[PDB]
């Protein structure tokens, strides 16, 4: 049922670029910040799909 | 004073050396060298971490007995190479100025490979001016596991 | 005890001529050509008069082969301040200089004189039967550097057998020198000079710079003052075979109680009860603060914390001149408390070595009438921070790839650098991981490595 | 994707209730906001399927 | 399949206990809720992270 | 059912994988801390789910 | 040996449930403390029989 | 008799170096390294001058930990009155601090500095085996404060087994404070670091303000005065370990004497025979007024009525220095006739403790030569109101959901704040359920 939803969250994992050695020391900090922001939203969506489907 | 397109901001120097044939000790010179070394972050590249030299002689060059000069690795030469290469390609696209550069032996492969290796040196130079692979640009400064 | 003395590189030849003229003023070898004390020509034939024996022309000349392809150091050992007191004809010059490049010496620029130095070592190795090893004055990259020491060590281990290979592997200060590439040769040192050797030492240059700029306060931050103090340390170590008597604690048990293991190969040195020429005004002759400032970083060659480096061995050495009963009198001074962190499988006591005959003082330097000394030389795991510093330097340089194309088109290999990295890692883990107390192998259930 | 691209569309179509309220400031302004957060993740994967149809 | 059946089986294996007593064990009950939901989500993301 | 319950807690005990001991001693200490976290949480929930059956 | 390890847990459940929790003093609370520590050691033996046997 | 103390926060490092300067001045531990009373360099370890370790060739250092993310605080400490003998190898600081909050220093930016100070704690934990708890200096919002402690107490209670420890929580004062969200960090610190603790006691800066401006008649509310007073108080506390006397009991004995419950956990440190250049000149010291002036409301760290303040314990600490004869005379002159309102169904045995070998008073401070100490470490079940007032202000400010947005995107959720309110309400209502006298 959510075996495609876990593939969607694995695509959110697949939206991760490499941490860019070819990346300025200010810029891959921004990659890390948008990473942690997007998995904050992903954790909110994860507890959404955990709590809502249990009913 | 530096005889190039001056840009300390666009500077990642690799090996600097200034011969001090002015008769004075090198302790204050090395202290000021450390001050110039650490006061700006553009010089921080950290390959061969003793990439300086202080050679002192006592033979004067001219009637001004105590003086010095500047020699030092140049990294703002990328804009010089571009300023020459793109105005070579400015007068190459329309087969410009083949009045007598049509030589005794002429090919298109020689000019094409000339500009391709010019591109492959300026692009590798700008890849080495970027991609901070010693300061903090690795994956192991922020722990080890960040997916 | 008639060990062959090899001196290559600029530092090797520099401290070779310096220390051998310190023996000349120590053994009384006047610029006349012979001593006025013992009338045997060249040198004596006592137990301690054994470094100088009959090889050259019947005159018992000082015994040291001086080879280096840099010709200016051979010139200034030929045209320094002593012209006949060394070997009158056995110093052969070098034709083309390596000029601060190590990798040329091992593969390209030093290969013409390897046959000549093999002839010299066959000349000086078929000599008198006393040969406990080799007094190697190793260098990294000054002249030829590690090249001739490396080829000599490898062909001496695969051709001469299993003789001891006592090294003075100097790890110089980058401030006073001019090269940058030095981590490459200092990490090829492990591959080409460490495994096929049998015993080694350490001499340094950073602590002498630190005391000369701040503590000893001598305005001479060059190789000359470094030579002036390393001459004292070389005279101190050679005083075991040079001062024979009731307490001749010589090399024989010394080489036994230095090294415990294959890759515990690197000892440490803590000689600094020094009194300067600007302190040479009849000041305090101390036997208490030289015991009280032992583990402070002043005596240490490399600034390391003793709080983290466990010791599997400790070799104490107090060479004085006053009384042989002062051995017991100094045993009963400070040795009773000594609560020092140790490996749980090593002994505790301290050996004692004294040379109660007073020496002859070196003039024209930064030293007073030095008579007594402290040195807590041992193999310590606290050099793991120094080797981690060297490996950090080499990792940064290998990320920068400085002079890689200089150092690959002559006979080296990137896989050879990988194997040198593995050899350096072995020397690390015999001091980092295995060197610390490994008691965590008895048994417990928490989820550890079973 | 390209047939599972509409499977995340039926995932959003499936588990999106009406915003039933629970207390003030909640369940009609912040659960609605986490639903719009889901929609902005949908927008992001729309500009990221913009670049997978490129390949 | 069996993974999501396991995850929802553990979700239904965390029932809300009865409210009774002089409010000692209720805080431990809330702690048990929040923690055990956290590691069931952790098991979920690990299982769907390998796949 | 007891069969599915203990077989499934065994299956998530198989989701306690063998480690990756590659790295230095500090990376192995971080691995050790992750191991203590996972062992603590997983045996606490094992005994808790056993108590929810009987003990 | 897996079916052995599941049918015994079944027999730790089956043959002895907790005795009738009604005793004619407050000492039945004491014997319920006995039985909750008894289920603590059933927790103990149940984490032995799966980890020191099949792990 | 060996313990190593850690200090976090700016005010934590301030009280730490003030108290360590007082220690080194009152044991004779000179800035020359050695103590001139004997011939051991650096310090010593005999029975009670045991705040050192053999680091060098007999060299001893005043072992402590000074940690703050803001980097200039260790620089202004290191240029102080005890200049160069602080450790040149463990003064670990960051680059940019959390800048007066909780969440960033705890969850996000401190997560790459917790393991570094943990490795430092392990390296100092490979040293001498004497261990009798800890001494953690922190505040609620001074420097990093709650951000380090809320993680490191959990890390200590998980990584280092079940070892005892002790911490110092600086209770704030809104009249000299620098923040507004102090109810939030206070309630978060109180549900986190107190349930993973072994011993603690809270010191109120507003109590120092009251005993200075309302009891000593001085007119200077500066943190230097607070640092000197905290140095005096913590020196009097530690003087049992620091000097041996008649009842030279360890701090482990104190913490296994005081705490009755995981929730009933906090004392009321009763030490106000207040002194300065004013109230030490030509006065007379006696064992009656300093002991009769304890239970009164204007002598307390946390405010309580004497009849409404119920003493579960009435432990006492004396600096002594003359005789135990007058102390065992005051056990009948003061302590025996104490029919003061007490707690029901608990023993009513008063405890005294005298520690000889005087700690030297502060040099260059304000107070003149003083003798006695009445550091009566009682406890009070009616300190539930002292946090119920903060819970009431947190209710009146938390229904408006103020400053929530700074504490959302750093990992937590609104359930964490509801759990913090639940934990403090549970502690308070447990005190009016069984802590305050019941049936």
Environment class of residue G26 by beta-carbon count within 10 Å: exposed (0-12), middle (13-18) or buried (19+)? exposed
Report the 10 Å Cβ neighbour count for B71. Answer: 11
**Spatial separation of the C-alpha atoms in residues H407 and H101, rounded to whole Å:** 9
Report the 10 Å Cβ neighbour count for C258. Answer: 20
Query: Would an 8 Å CB–CB cutoff place C213 in contact with chain B?
Result: yes
**Spatial separation of the C-alpha atoms in residues H49 and H60, rounded to whole Å:** 11
**Spatial separation of the C-alpha atoms in residues G43 and G49, rounded to whole Å:** 10
CB H372 within 8 A of CB H273: yes
- For domain H5-268, give its CATH number from 1.10.10.10, 3.30.420.130, 2.60.40.10, 3.40.50.1440: 3.40.50.1440
Q: Which residues contact H296 (CB under 8 A, 6 or more apart)?
A: H306
**Spatial separation of the C-alpha atoms in residues D24 and E24, rounded to whole Å:** 29
Chains that touch A (3 or more CB pairs under 8 A): B, D, E, H
User: Residues of H marked as binding?
Assistant: 9-11, 14, 70, 98, 139, 142-145, 178, 182, 205, 223, 227, 251
Token pair of B110 as six digits: 């020689």
* Neighbouring-strand partners of residue H318: H354
Environment class of residue B64 by beta-carbon count within 10 Å: exposed (0-12), middle (13-18) or buried (19+)? exposed
Among F34, A55, E38, D32, CA closest to H415 = E38
Among H197, H202, H167, H305, CA closest to H261 = H197
DSSP state of C362: P
Token pair of B131 as six digits: 């991609």
Helix (H, G, I), strand (E, B) or coil at H137: strand
Locate tokens 């900090």: which residue?
Answer: A29
Q: Which residues contact G4 (CB under 8 A, 6 or more apart)?
A: none
Query: Would an 8 Å CB–CB cutoff place F39 in contact with chain H?
Result: no
Token pair of H78 as six digits: 């290191």
Determine if residue C178 is labeled as part of a ligand binding site. yes
Cα distance from N-terminal residue to C-terminal residue, chain G: 12
CA G7 to chain centroid: 14
Locate tokens 């929530």: which residue?
Answer: H404
In chain C, what are the helix, strand and coil shares in percent, each to the nearest 5?
35, 5, 60
In chain B, count H helices and then E strands: 3, 2
Query: Would an 8 Å CB–CB cutoff place A52 in contact with chain B?
Result: no
Q: Which fold has domain B1-76?
A: 60s Ribosomal Protein L30; Chain: A; (3.30.1330)
**Spatial separation of the C-alpha atoms in residues F45 and C364, rounded to whole Å:** 79
Q: Do G and D touch, counting CB pairs below 8 Å (3 needed)?
A: no
Torsion of CA D34, D37, D41, D44, to 10 degrees: 180
**Spatial separation of the C-alpha atoms in residues H66 and H74, rounded to whole Å:** 8
**Spatial separation of the C-alpha atoms in residues D21 and D31, rounded to whole Å:** 9
**Spatial separation of the C-alpha atoms in residues C190 and C171, rounded to whole Å:** 13
CB C321 within 8 A of CB C329: no
Among C198, C157, C153, C189, CA closest to C170 = C189
Locate tokens 């998530």: which residue?
Answer: F12
The closest CB to that of F12, out of E32, E36, E43, belongs to E43
Residue H253 designated active-site: yes
Query: Would an 8 Å CB–CB cutoff place H95 in contact with chain B?
Result: no
Q: Do A and E touch, counting CB pairs below 8 Å (3 needed)?
A: yes
Token pair of C428 as six digits: 């690390």
Determine if residue C144 is labeled as part of a ligand binding site. yes
Among B74, C368, A29, CA closest to H112 = A29
Token pair of C135 as six digits: 């007094």
Environment class of residue H37 by beta-carbon count within 10 Å: exposed (0-12), middle (13-18) or buried (19+)? exposed
D17 vs A contacts (CB less than 8 Å)? 52
**Spatial separation of the C-alpha atoms in residues F48 and F30, rounded to whole Å:** 27
Q: Are strands B71-72 and C170-171 parallel, antiparallel or unpaired?
A: unpaired
User: Where do runs of H (alpha helix) occur along chain D?
Assistant: 7-14, 31-49
Q: State which approach was used to obtain the coordinates.
A: cryo-EM
B135 vs A contacts (CB less than 8 Å)? 25
CATH class of C4-258: alpha beta
Report the 10 Å Cβ neighbour count for H217. Answer: 11
CB C374 within 8 A of CB C294: yes
Environment class of residue B97 by beta-carbon count within 10 Å: exposed (0-12), middle (13-18) or buried (19+)? exposed
Token pair of F2 as six digits: 């007891």
Environment class of residue H245 by beta-carbon count within 10 Å: exposed (0-12), middle (13-18) or buried (19+)? buried
Helix (H), strand (E) at residue G50: helix G27-51
CA C32 to chain centroid: 31
HEC profile of H37-84:
CCCCCCCCCCCCCCCCCECCCCCECCCEEEEECCCHHHHHHHCCCCCC
Residue of G43, G45, G52, G53 to mutate when probing chain F, most F C-beta within 10 A: G43
Environment class of residue C328 by beta-carbon count within 10 Å: exposed (0-12), middle (13-18) or buried (19+)? exposed
Among B93, B72, B87, CA closest to B118 = B87
What are the C-alpha distances in Å from C428 to residues C152, C284, C309, C357, C382?
A: 25, 42, 13, 41, 11
The closest CB to that of B131, out of A19, A21, A32, belongs to A21
CB H143 within 8 A of CB H13: yes
Among B127, B126, B91, B125, CA closest to B111 = B91
Question: If you compute the radius of gyration of chain G from its CA atoms, what whole number of angstroms results?
Answer: 14
Among E4, G10, E14, G49, CA closest to F3 = G10
Locate tokens 């080879």: which residue?
Answer: C67
DSSP state of G22: -
Among H54, H61, H63, H46, CA closest to H5 = H63
What are the C-alpha distances in Å from C182 to residues C175, C208, C309, C394, H44?
A: 12, 19, 26, 9, 44
Interface list for E 1-51 with F (CB within 8 A): 2, 6, 9-10, 13, 15, 32, 35-36, 39, 42-43, 46-47
CB H376 within 8 A of CB H270: yes
What are the C-alpha distances in Å from G50 to residues B128, D20, G14, G36, G43?
A: 56, 45, 19, 21, 11
H423 vs E contacts (CB less than 8 Å)? 27
Report the 10 Å Cβ neighbour count for C221. Answer: 19
Report the 10 Å Cβ neighbour count for C308. Answer: 16
């Amino acid at each position: 049922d959510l075996l495609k939803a876990v593939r969607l969250i694995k695509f959110l994992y697949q939206s991760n670029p490499p941490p860019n050695p070819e990346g300025t020391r200010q810029a891959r900090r921004n990659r890390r910040r948008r990473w942690r922001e997007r998995q904050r939203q992903i954790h909110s969506i994860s507890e959404r799909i955990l709590s809502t489907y249990l009913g | 004073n530096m005889m190039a397109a001056c840009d300390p901001r666009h500077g990642r120097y690799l090996t600097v050396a200034a011969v001090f044939r002015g008769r004075m000790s090198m302790k204050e010179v090395d202290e000021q060298m450390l001050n110039v070394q650490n006061k700006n972050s553009s010089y921080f590249v950290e390959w061969i971490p003793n990439n300086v030299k202080t050679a002192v002689c006592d033979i004067p060059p001219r009637g001004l007995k105590m003086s010095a000069t500047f020699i030092g690795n140049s990294t703002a030469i990328q804009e010089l190479f571009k300023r020459i290469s793109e105005q070579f390609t400015a007068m190459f696209r329309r087969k410009a100025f083949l009045h007598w550069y049509t030589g005794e032996g002429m090919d298109e492969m020689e000019f094409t490979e000339a500009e391709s290796n010019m591109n492959d040196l300026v692009s590798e130079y700008q890849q080495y001016q970027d991609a901070t692979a010693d300061e903090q640009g690795e994956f192991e400064e922020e722990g080890e596991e960040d997916e | 005890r008639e060990c062959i003395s090899i001196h290559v590189g600029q530092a090797g030849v520099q401290i070779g001529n310096a220390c051998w003229e310190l023996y000349c003023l120590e053994h009384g070898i006047q610029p006349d050509g012979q001593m006025p004390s013992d009338k045997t020509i060249g040198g004596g034939d006592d137990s301690f008069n054994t470094f100088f024996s009959e090889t050259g022309a019947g005159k018992h000349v000082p015994r040291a082969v001086f080879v280096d392809l840099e010709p200016t150091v051979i010139d200034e050992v030929r045209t320094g301040t002593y012209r006949q007191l060394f070997h009158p004809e056995q110093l052969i010059t070098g034709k083309e200089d390596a000029a601060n490049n190590y990798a040329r010496g091992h593969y390209t620029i030093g290969k013409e004189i390897i046959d000549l130095v093999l002839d010299r070592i066959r000349k000086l190795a078929d000599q008198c039967t006393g040969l406990q090893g080799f007094s190697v004055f190793h260098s990294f990259g000054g002249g030829t550097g590690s090249g001739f020491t490396s080829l000599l060590m490898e062909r001496l281990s695969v051709d001469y057998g299993k003789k001891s290979k006592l090294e003075f592997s100097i790890y110089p200060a980058p401030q006073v020198s001019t090269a940058v590439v030095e981590p490459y040769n200092s990490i090829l040192t492990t591959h080409t000079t460490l495994e096929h050797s049998d015993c080694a030492f350490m001499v340094d240059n950073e602590a002498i710079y630190d005391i000369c700029r701040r503590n000893l306060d001598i305005e001479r931050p060059t190789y000359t003052n470094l030579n002036r103090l390393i001459g004292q340390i070389v005279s101190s170590i050679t005083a075991s075979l040079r001062f024979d008597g009731a307490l001749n604690v010589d090399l024989t048990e010394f080489q036994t109680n230095l090294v415990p293991y294959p890759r515990a190969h690197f000892p440490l040195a803590t000689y600094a009860p020094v009194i300067s020429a600007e302190k040479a005004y009849h000041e305090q002759l101390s036997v208490a603060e030289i015991t009280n400032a032992c583990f402070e970083p002043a005596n240490q060659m490399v600034k390391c914390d003793p709080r983290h480096g466990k010791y599997m061995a400790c070799c104490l050495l107090y060479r004085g001149d006053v009384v042989p009963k002062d051995v017991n009198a100094a045993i009963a001074t400070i040795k009773t408390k000594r609560t020092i962190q140790f490996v749980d499988w090593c002994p505790t006591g301290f050996k004692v070595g004294i040379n109660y005959e007073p020496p002859t003082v070196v003039p024209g330097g930064d030293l007073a009438k030095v008579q007594r000394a402290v040195c807590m030389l041992s193999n310590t795991t606290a050099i793991a921070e120094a080797w981690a510093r060297l490996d950090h330097k080499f990792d940064l340089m290998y990320a920068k790839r400085a002079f890689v194309h200089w150092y690959v088109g002559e006979g080296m290999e990137e896989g050879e650098f990988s194997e040198a990295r593995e050899d350096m890692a072995a020397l690390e883990k015999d001091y980092e991981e295995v060197g610390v107390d490994s008691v965590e192998g008895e048994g417990e259930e928490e989820g550890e490595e079973y």
